[PDB]
Design an enzyme around this catalytic site. Structure first.
Site, PDB file in Angstrom:
ATOM      1  N   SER C  94      24.545   8.601 -20.008  1.00 30.63           N
ATOM      2  CA  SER C  94      25.653   8.248 -20.888  1.00 30.63           C
ATOM      3  C   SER C  94      25.881   9.496 -21.730  1.00 30.63           C
ATOM      4  CB  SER C  94      25.307   7.060 -21.793  1.00 30.63           C
ATOM      5  OG  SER C  94      25.229   5.868 -21.049  1.00 30.63           O
ATOM      6  N   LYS C 169      31.808   3.187 -20.699  1.00 31.86           N
ATOM      7  CA  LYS C 169      30.545   2.899 -21.360  1.00 31.86           C
ATOM      8  C   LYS C 169      30.719   2.977 -22.883  1.00 31.86           C
ATOM      9  CE  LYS C 169      26.165   2.247 -22.065  1.00 31.86           C
ATOM     10  NZ  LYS C 169      25.263   3.386 -21.719  1.00 31.86           N
ATOM     11  N   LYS C 237      22.602   6.646 -31.104  1.00 29.88           N
ATOM     12  CA  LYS C 237      22.958   7.783 -30.273  1.00 29.88           C
ATOM     13  C   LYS C 237      24.296   7.468 -29.577  1.00 29.88           C
ATOM     14  CE  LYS C 237      21.915   7.707 -26.272  1.00 29.88           C
ATOM     15  NZ  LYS C 237      22.493   7.292 -24.954  1.00 29.88           N
TER      16      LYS C 237
END
Lengths: 291, 291, 291, 291
Positions: C94, C169, C237
């Site tokens: 990601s 995502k 994150k």
């Protein structure tokens, strides 16, 4: 004396030029062309940061980010690739407070002194030697470089140990940004309420609403004077430093986070290169009502 | 001339006392018991409202919220049902800007002048005659009441026409709140970063972060001195005017909205009765780091 | 066919183990020690990166951040300096949507196909082969790798061209964060109001408040069950990708910005290692009222 | 049986009509004209709330705000101006949770039972008897009125004691508002990132991002279908109830406060009468990028 300067951008170039016109000896290095006026004063343009260092006792640094300061100090041909015993490194870049502490420490282990001294005042402040300088480091070292800070700026302050300089700068940029946003909220509301921005700003001057932002920027918002004095794109970089530190230190800064997003709105609407006082255009857009 | 006071209490009382102390004859009224001091100074506690308006050409109103100012104006025992011709009504309460607009023209069509002159300075300000006064109305009317305002405060400012007085006060309260929150985010951060708040504050004092808030309130946060000067509960009621006004005028005041919520965190943690400089505690809580 | 895995660890490892368990021959690599299970299953722990790319037509990358994916791609020991012709590279990390855009066309001009297929489901998802997979790329390429994705997860979705996988995502993580925060504000409020969270949750289940978050995470908040499923540090994150992307694309994501700050309050109070449903604790703290 | 209905607006009228078509006996009263179809079914339009009450055993109420509910119950010619012994009052208005507790209590002291049962589903839900009904009060009383709730709605829930109904509604409106805003942030970001809103919404459906809002409203934002289903002006009223409760209970609801401001932006840009799914136009404006 033997001073070195790494980074000659819109800030670095005029700062170096100021030290050169003061009769100091300078070896410089920048990504690109050096100013004619600078070499014109004795400055010697070398090729790498390592060479500036091999020459000077006090090394000044003016690079864009934490990574550059990082590379300049320990890169493949940086300041550390040569002995730093007895030297003094002065980073005047605005970078991470936390990374700074680490940098200053490893340069200490190589026998050199470290001073983090980010500035504020922009390119005009740099041309005219009126820069504001917040310094992190030890007094004796500060006293030693002070004569040089005097040529470069006006308001100089030892805020404490290594890192406090960067930290003091982050705090200044948070307040400046939040203060600009508040004046924007207060004036756009006043305006759509029917009141005259000119009067309100005057009324509010005497009282607790008073601040330098309300004085200088409140004026620019009324007069619509947004010519660069400090580009929004730059303040976005500064707030980005703020938020990342906030993340690292686990700090909840609700209004700094929003100000960053408000600036994103300015960007999306052609305000990235205007003066951060144009931040007011965001709220006007959001309320559909210009001053 | 011959004056009238329709609201006593925390601030209305010491204000009436100052007007009476200057030789004026006041016909006062309020729900509570009239302080002896102004009774034994000339004030005639005429049992109710419609009466104050009768033997008085200039009527001062110092009531709590917008609705109570409306009832004093147009209620059974109110200033209504009584000739208002040739009179001047001055509301010094901090109420709704939009509302004031219509209260004014209502009174105006009844044959009287209206000045909305919200005040700031708190209890101590009212007693000392050093209140700041922002005024909305017609100049000649303002000029007429001016000698009285002079007894009540120092900073008197005619902001514009009816409603601009209130709008000016709201604008003041937004900036005081946002500036206080800004100093809180910057110092809590500077602190958790390892810097000394006294230092950072000292530095930021000489630049663009400079404010009347960082100077006074900044200090209040460091020395942990939060005894009331202006209760959070009070600044809460004020931020509610801004947010309700904002909602009516369709303004997006993001940081004012947040500030109100942060005050909710203070009240939730016993800060309702402290100086609004106590704001800092909300961010200390959210960061688990004080000072 | 003949596959390659360039990132093991928390998720890369059980993923490789699932591909190896299906009969495929994998040439793997990573900084840490290759788990015995996949070594004794066929995987050849070729000491480094450039090698995985040699004996493999489809290369899987499961590294931590955007920069590490860039080095794997174009670094000395990377997939570069090795023919990429006729190969398919699939990044399942990601990372940055904007970055992926250029990594892709870089690899594309070197003679290889690129699929960015970020995943969600966490550790347990990777082992169980029930990961959700959003994919950006060309259909035929997607169709080719499809049988492998089928082994790695259930929900596989071709979202669009290169970069849309990552963008998908990020979008997922924003909503999960904002929805979790929403349930937190509603229930903490319902609770402090005197209502039973179990009840309110039960009601809201049958209407427009209904969500996959209120159902699962809602429950996690009531029974105080926060054992990891997805660490706050992790969602932190992720929200950083959204905010950095937002900054680059100039998007004002106010509630995502705030959510990141609220997570800062959690980390500040020992929630970094808990399930992101632990978010509720931030509002409980800010209201001084739990449940 | 003897039922009474006070308030016949776009919700009340069709609700009363539903009870009348079920063969129940009704006396109604509204500020204005009663529906022909309602009187057409036996309903008797009386003049005041007191008379509706003198007639009925179970009194239903559908007024706009806490003040109306207040006036209808204890006003000069309201429900309390007559004996309420053995009666049941059912307020289906969306009003303050805190004021409700007090109301229910004083009606209890007058020998009557109280049920607060705000609804959700809008005017279509009211015409078709599919309203969602969250109820505060005692079971036995709830069981007694249930047959009537069945005609009026579909999803009926006893959430607890008096006030929990209003409270449950506030929580539903907070989540609905926050959920709509999140989908807006996630889709506008995805769109400006280059991804296709249609796909992302589909991808995100299977997973934790899933919610009824993403299903219904996410669609409306893509198709641009903003025809009133629930006007933004109305949701602003609902959030206003939320925030005032938050203020009274000292709750920090950061994203509810922002959503209210985001709605202020919609208003200022002609979205007050569109469906709250148009909330997405705010972020588009703020990022200068429509889907």
């Amino acid at each position: 004396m033997k001073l070195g300067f790494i980074g000659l951008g819109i800030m670095g170039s005029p700062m170096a030029i100021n030290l050169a016109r003061a009769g100091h000896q300078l070896h410089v290095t920048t990504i690109g062309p050096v100013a004619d006026e600078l070499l014109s004063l004795g400055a010697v343009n070398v090729e790498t940061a390592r060479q500036v260092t091999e020459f000077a006792d006090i090394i000044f640094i003016m690079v864009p980010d934490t990574p550059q300061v990082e590379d300049v100090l320990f890169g493949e041909h940086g300041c550390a690739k040569t002995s730093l015993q007895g030297k003094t490194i002065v980073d005047m870049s605005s970078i991470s407070p936390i990374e700074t502490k680490r940098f200053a420490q490893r340069v200490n282990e190589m026998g050199a002194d470290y001073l983090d001294a980010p500035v504020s005042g922009g390119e005009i402040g740099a041309r005219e030697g009126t820069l504001s300088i917040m310094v992190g480091g030890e007094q004796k070292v500060f006293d030693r470089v002070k004569p040089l800070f005097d040529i470069l700026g006006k308001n100089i302050t030892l805020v404490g140990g290594n890192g406090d300089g960067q930290t003091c700068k982050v705090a200044n940029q948070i307040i400046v940004a939040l203060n600009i946003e508040a004046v924007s909220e207060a004036l756009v509301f006043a305006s759509k309420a029917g009141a005259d921005p000119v009067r309100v700003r005057q009324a509010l001057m005497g009282g607790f609403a008073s601040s330098r932002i309300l004085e200088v920027h409140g004026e620019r918002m009324i007069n619509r004077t947004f010519e660069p004095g400090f580009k929004i794109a730059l303040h976005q970089k500064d707030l980005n430093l703020a938020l990342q530190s906030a993340k690292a230190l686990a700090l909840n800064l609700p209004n700094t986070a929003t100000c960053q997003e408000l600036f994103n709105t300015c960007a999306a609407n052609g305000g990235s290169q205007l003066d951060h006082s144009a931040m007011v255009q965001a709220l006007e857009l959001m309320a559909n009502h210009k001053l």
